[PDB]
Amino acid sequence: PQITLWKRPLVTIKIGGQLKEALLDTGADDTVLEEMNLPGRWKPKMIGGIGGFIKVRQYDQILIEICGHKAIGTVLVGPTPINIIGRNLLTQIGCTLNF
Amino acid sequence: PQITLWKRPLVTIKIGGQLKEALLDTGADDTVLEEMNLPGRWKPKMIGGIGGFIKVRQYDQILIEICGHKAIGTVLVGPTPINIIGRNLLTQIGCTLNF
Numbered sequence: 326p327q328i329t330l331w332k333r334p335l336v337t338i339k340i341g342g343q344l345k346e347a348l349l350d351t352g353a354d355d356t357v358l359e360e361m362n363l364p365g366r367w368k369p370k371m372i373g374g375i376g377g378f379i380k381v382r383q384y385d386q387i388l389i390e391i392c393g394h395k396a397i398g399t400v401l402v403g404p405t406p407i408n409i410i411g412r413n414l415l416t417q418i419g420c421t422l423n424f
Numbered sequence: 425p426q427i428t429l430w431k432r433p434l435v436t437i438k439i440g441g442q443l444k445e446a447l448l449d450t451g452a453d454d455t456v457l458e459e460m461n462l463p464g465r466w467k468p469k470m471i472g473g474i475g476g477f478i479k480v481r482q483y484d485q486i487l488i489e490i491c492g493h494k495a496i497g498t499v500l501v502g503p504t505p506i507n508i509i510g511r512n513l514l515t516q517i518g519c520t521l522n523f
């Protein structure tokens with residue numbers, strides 16, 4: 326499909342058997358999701374943007390479905406104000422910018 | 425053009441008669457540029473990102489050309505980690521997400 330940018334590009338995703346709303350974000354290197362209790366091991370990480378850095382938990386090879394498009398890759402989990410789908414997964418669903 | 429997301433979607437912009445590199449950022453409502461000298465009046469504003477809130481200078485009705493496409497809109501100037509082009513200007517150049 327095609328998504329215009331008049332409003333925030335929020336879409337439904339499926340992760341760990343849960344449906345959430347997330348932002349398709351070309352400015353995010355990696356996917357970061359609001360606090361959630363995923364199982365498995367993880368690695369500490371810090372990611373930075375406007376305002377500074379937050380601490381997150383890095384989970385690897387996590388399956389996520391974005392608009393019915395399946396993907397698998399790194400998912401960060403932490404106190405982000407919003408669920409963010411980053412380039413690491415946007416590439417996997419064939420997402421491009423067009424103008 | 426069609427821009428894939430394996431690398432950061434960095435493009436050259438022209439603002440205040442000066443060339444700069446900036447990130448096309450569909451997750452940003454607004455356009456935020458690193459510290460620079462812009463002519464005309466400005467108002468102090470606050471904006472929040474993943475790590476909290478920063479103080480910025482708001483310039484309205486600024487001419488800015490993004491990858492050969494002209495836009496006239498609001499540009500925030502402050503301590504952002506990188507020049508980001510947000511939806512307020514992405515809409516003006518006709519940018520959409522496609523997958």
Ligand SMILES: CC(C)CN(C[C@@H](O)[C@H](Cc1ccccc1)NC(=O)O[C@H]1CO[C@H]2OCC[C@H]21)S(=O)(=O)c1ccc(N)cc1
Pocket residue numbers: 350352353354355356357372373374375406407409411447449450451452453454455456471472473474475505506508510
């Ligand atoms: C600043 C960018 C280089 C990086 N950011 C993605 C960006 O899209 C954020 C994503 C974002 C969106 C909402 C809230 C927090 C973060 N947007 C943002 O900061 O925009 C601000 C300017 O316009 C306003 O609209 C949104 C917030 C303001 S980030 O959220 O900090 C980020 C950094 C690293 C990763 N792996 C994932 C995300």
